[PDB]
């Protein structure tokens, strides 16, 4: 029995070992209680404002759209403390951990951005943080691993399965299976078993709420479309949530196309995978013909995951949201364009969303359209990756 619906149509659920069901039920009850608690909301609002720096700017980008009928705004989650939107929901989940009386945090990370976000929230709020990371990701993300350790977090390499993000997801759940009476699992995206897709959406929805207020103030109307990249689904559902009932507003999610959908070297399960059951949820998966979980690929580690949150799969199925893909090369061009024409270095994740908005403009340059891209993060972290690719060309 649950307080909230664990499903979005056919997608979602609570596909965990029986031992973990009390942990999920406890978390759901604590969340429902917290959402009705003005003191909890006030402490969350205080952290978001005075520690993380909300509200974030909404920047009109005039140089990149000059000579077209596109008006493009960027929602500047790149300016949030930590340099990505992840900070919003780790502060909320750290407060849930404290509400339940817990002292310890478990987190998974691939790119390392969630590991750093979990570590910074834990440092601020007096929680002991341990982070699981696939050994291949540890090797690739020395800077983020060092940031996590500077903030006092334990980083535990995972050597099982493919030694990457899905393997760290598994290890975090293995640990929680034996530790949930003392530790909270701070899941890094709007995916996994109920109640995480719901919690992470509600702890990211200020992105879309601020965007709505800002665009009304500046333009006197709603956007024609809001556009966000989709790794697990958190920044996109955070931007989308407050617009879902505004039926005129397009919701466009951008999956990584990697080397191209036809190559199979991509991270686009929502449109190019198959529904499966993994990481506690029924959701579109990249998987082998016989049901093993496949290796995803993107130039951007933040998008490199073989599944997607269940609310995106549901919004797609009913036609409320549309999902597209952007290749590595399209993302790299968008990265270079924003640097040169706006003086903003975007995350390569966010560059996938920008690349699709630029395509919407360039394909139909006399179409009047008011677009918002969720600039989910800053791209300082990506300049080595971009240097190496431009060098190899």
């Amino acid at each position: 029995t649950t307080l909230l619906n664990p499903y979005f149509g056919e997608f979602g659920g609570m596909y965990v070992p029986q031992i973990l069901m009390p942990a999920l039920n406890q978390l759901e009850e604590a969340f429902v209680s917290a959402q009705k608690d003005p003191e909890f909301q006030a402490q969350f609002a205080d952290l978001l404002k005075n520690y993380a720096g909300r509200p974030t700017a909404l920047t009109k980008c005039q140089n990149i759209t000059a000579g077209t009928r596109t008006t493009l705004y960027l929602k500047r989650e790149d300016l949030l403390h930590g340099g990505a939107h992840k900070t919003n929901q780790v502060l909320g989940q750290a407060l849930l951990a404290k509400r339940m009386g817990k002292s310890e945090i478990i987190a998974e990370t691939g790119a390392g951005q969630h590991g750093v976000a979990s570590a910074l929230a834990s440092a601020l709020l007096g929680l002991k943080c341990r982070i699981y990371m696939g050994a291949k990701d540890v090797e690739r993300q020395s800077p983020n691993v060092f940031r996590m350790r500077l903030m006092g977090a334990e980083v535990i390499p995972v050597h099982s399965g493919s030694a990457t993000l899905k393997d760290a997801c598994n290890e975090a759940l293995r640990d929680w299976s034996g530790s949930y009476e003392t530790a909270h699992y701070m899941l890094g995206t709007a995916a996994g078993p109920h109640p995480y897709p719901t919690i992470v959406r509600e702890f990211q929805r200020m992105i879309g709420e601020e965007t709505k207020a800002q665009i009304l103030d500046k333009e006197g109307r709603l956007p024609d479309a809001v556009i966000a990249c989709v790794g697990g689904g958190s920044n996109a559902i955070g931007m989308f949530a407050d617009f879902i009932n505004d039926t005129s507003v397009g919701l466009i999610g951008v999956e990584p196309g990697g080397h191209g959908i036809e190559t199979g070297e991509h991270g686009a399960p929502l449109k190019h995978g198959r529904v499966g059951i993994y990481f506690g949820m029924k959701a579109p998966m990249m998987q082998t013909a016989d049901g093993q979980i496949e290796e995803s690929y993107s130039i951007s580690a933040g998008l490199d995951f073989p599944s997607v949150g269940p609310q995106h799969a549901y919004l797609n199925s009913i036609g409320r949201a549309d999902y597209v893909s952007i290749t590595d090369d399209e993302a790299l061009e968008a990265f270079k364009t924003l640097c040169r024409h706006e003086g903003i270095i975007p995350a390569l994740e966010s560059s996938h969303a920008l690349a699709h908005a630029l395509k919407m403009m360039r394909e139909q340059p006399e179409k009047e359209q008011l677009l918002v891209v969720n600039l989910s993060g800053r791209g300082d972290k990506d300049i080595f990756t971009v240097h190496d690719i431009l060098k190899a060309r």
């Binding site: 029986q18 099982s160 399965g161 598994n170 293995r174 299976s177 034996g178 998987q287 049901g291 979980i293």
Partner: protein
């Protein structure tokens, strides 16, 4: 078929517990795995619990994580596992055979079709490790339509509602978890379970097998003394495979000695 019901009736008539080893199918290869399983049976296994290698075994500790990886290094697929299961049943007509599955391998080509294939090869039960009772309906319905026992987990912190659910829905045996956490011989259960065993019998549950952390004969004896119908051991068995990869002969000798000792502990 009624293979668990027949086994437990025969063991009850001898005042005897069941000893049930777990191994990963195709660890360390298909041919050696078939020899291992025949050795387990010859040495006194009453039933088997057999894992299909899966990319993401999130209820398993490192020993069985590494068994899955060895089977993958040998190219073992679920299709090859079902060929092995058909041949095990062709050799051994009465031993109950239980599978340890993860949900995606059951759902992949259709839940009903999965349980139909289990019936065709002569499997007796399926435990889907990442499907709790809350998500179990299509799995348990398909199991029962195909004469497969759906195996439910009774955790140590089970409340009365969960005991009644596991008791009503389950068949074959009830899995009595020793402890929280994941599979592993390095972590022994240190909670008495006789109260859960008594409540399960009161609610007419399938007979209980204790599992997780069972690595010694005294634990098998203790499970029976507490009122359980028997005990499952996986990591302790898989550790003998891992230790003896270079000597297939010594591997079978040590598996025989271990299973013999664990089965002796179940006898009246």
């Amino acid at each position: 078929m009624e293979r668990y019901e027949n086994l437990f009736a025969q063991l009850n008539d001898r005042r005897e517990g069941a000893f049930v080893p777990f191994v990963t199918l195709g660890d360390p290869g298909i041919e050696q795995s078939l020899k291992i399983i025949d050795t387990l049976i010859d040495a006194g296994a009453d039933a088997l619990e057999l894992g299909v290698p899966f990319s993401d075994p999130l209820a398993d500790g490192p020993t069985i994580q590494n068994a899955n990886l060895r089977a993958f290094a040998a190219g073992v697929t679920p299709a090859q596992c079902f060929e092995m299961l058909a041949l095990i049943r062709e050799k051994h007509p009465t031993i109950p055979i239980g599978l340890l599955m993860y949900a995606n391998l059951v759902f992949n080509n259709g839940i009903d079709a999965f349980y139909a294939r289990c019936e065709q090869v002569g499997v007796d039960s399926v435990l889907v490790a990442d499907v709790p009772v809350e998500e179990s309906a299509p799995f348990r319905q398909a199991a029962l339509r195909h004469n497969i026992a759906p195996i439910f987990i009774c955790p140590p912190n089970a409340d009365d509602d969960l005991l009644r659910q596991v008791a009503s829905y389950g068949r074959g045996y009830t899995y009595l978890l020793s402890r929280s956490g994941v599979t592993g011989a390095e972590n022994r259960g240190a909670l008495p379970l006789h109260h859960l065993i008594e409540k399960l019998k009161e609610y007419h549950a399938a007979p209980a097998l204790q599992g997780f952390g069972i690595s010694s004969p005294e634990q098998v004896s203790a499970a029976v003394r507490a009122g359980a119908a028997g005990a499952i051991s996986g990591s302790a068995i898989v550790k003998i495979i891992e230790k003896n990869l270079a000597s297939p002969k010594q591997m079978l000798a040590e598996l025989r000695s271990f299973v013999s000792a664990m089965k002796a502990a179940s006898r009246a």
